[PDB]
Structure 1
Amino acid sequence: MKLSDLRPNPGANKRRKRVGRGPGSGHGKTATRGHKGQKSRSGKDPRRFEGGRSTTLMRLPKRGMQGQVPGEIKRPRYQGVNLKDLARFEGEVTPELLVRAGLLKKGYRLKILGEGEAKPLKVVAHAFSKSALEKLKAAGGEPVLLE
């Protein structure tokens, strides 16, 4: 395997579409922009703009709390993980040991959740849902609850 062999698979590299470069191309003259009018010009935001009529968005009404200065309130937050996700572990499970595993995102208080089979496991968590608690306290799990 030398240099002249190194080749990218079919369609791994593909030609650009070069417009405005002669009739046979496609693609020439107008350059796929049709005839006249802004959009053919060099240069309006079509996600929002709608022609001077009141937009689709701006006629919808606002909902709920927008928050005000000095902005967002620090309260604790809870990420759930599902009993099924607890599957790969043996012995004791903490939030710490959940993060460093990529199940529980950092700075999130841990809340065990229902979906899945309770494993007879010591699980240390900031919170348990109902059917999570029952399930565990029935497969012989040990639901330590910290603060």
Structure 2
Amino acid sequence: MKLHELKPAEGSRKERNRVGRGVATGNGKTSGRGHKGQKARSGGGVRPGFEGGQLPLFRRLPKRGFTNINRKEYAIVNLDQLNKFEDGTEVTPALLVESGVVKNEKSGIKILGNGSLDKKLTVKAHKFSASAAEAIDAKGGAHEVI
């Protein structure tokens, strides 16, 4: 381009609304606020969730549960994600990370059975579902619980 003929992409910029600059803008005197009360005032309005003294919704409902502080979460890889590999290749967690299927192996790797495998390989992970091990051994191949 030239620096004297710069042009933004179409529909990518917009001018901001400037409130309180006279009558014909449509936002002239009271500036969009209406006339009086709490919401007309500067710094006004009621804090979110407050409903005027009727008991709020998050006080009239009971608290339930607890949170387990050392819970395990596993990186999930499904069966149709394994078809990017070649037959007979032996997949391991470090190979699954390096190939970029798993970004962040949280507490381990669980293989789940969602897609269709359609290859033959040997896998090594921390956890398998039932259907996953069925479809891995059914095509020929072995699974080994690291």
> Which residue, out of 78, 84, 90, partners 1:82?
78
Task: Please name the residue that 1:135 is paired with.
Answer: 135
- With normalisation by structure 2, the TM-score equals 0.84
Displacement after TM superposition at 1:143 (Å): 1.1
Q: Where do 4+ consecutive residues of structure 1 move more than 4 Å?
A: none
> For residues 135 and 41 of structure 2, what CA distance do their matches in structure 1 show?
65
Which residue of 1 is the match for residue 50 of structure 2? 49
The letter for the 1-side match of 2:60 is: R
Query: 1:10 is matched with which residue?
Result: 10
CA RMSD of the aligned region, Å?
Answer: 1.9
Q: Structure 1 regions of 5+ residues with no counterpart?
A: none
Partner of 1:109: 108
Letter in 2 for 1:45: R
**How many Å apart are 1:132 and its aligned residue?**
0.5
Asked if the contact 2:75–2:108 (Cα under 8 Å) also holds between the matched residues in 1, the reply is yes
Query: Identity over the aligned pairs, expressed in percent?
Result: 51
Gaps of 5+ in 2: none
Change (3 A) 1:130 1:30: same
Residue 120 of structure 2 aligns to a residue whose secondary structure is coil
C-alpha contact 1:19 1:27 (8 A) present in aligned 2: yes
Within 5 Å, which residues of 2 pair with 1:25-40?
Answer: 25-40=25-40
The more displaced of 33-42 and 92-101 is: 92-101
What is the SS of the residue equivalent to 1:34? coil
CA pair 120-4 structure 1, distance change in 2 beyond 3 A: same
Aligned length in residues: 140
Q: TM-score, normalised by structure 1?
A: 0.84
Over residues 55-102 of structure 1, what are the superposed CA-to-partner deviations in whole Å (9 max), with x where a residue is unaligned? 1121111111146xxxx23x5432321111222123222222333415
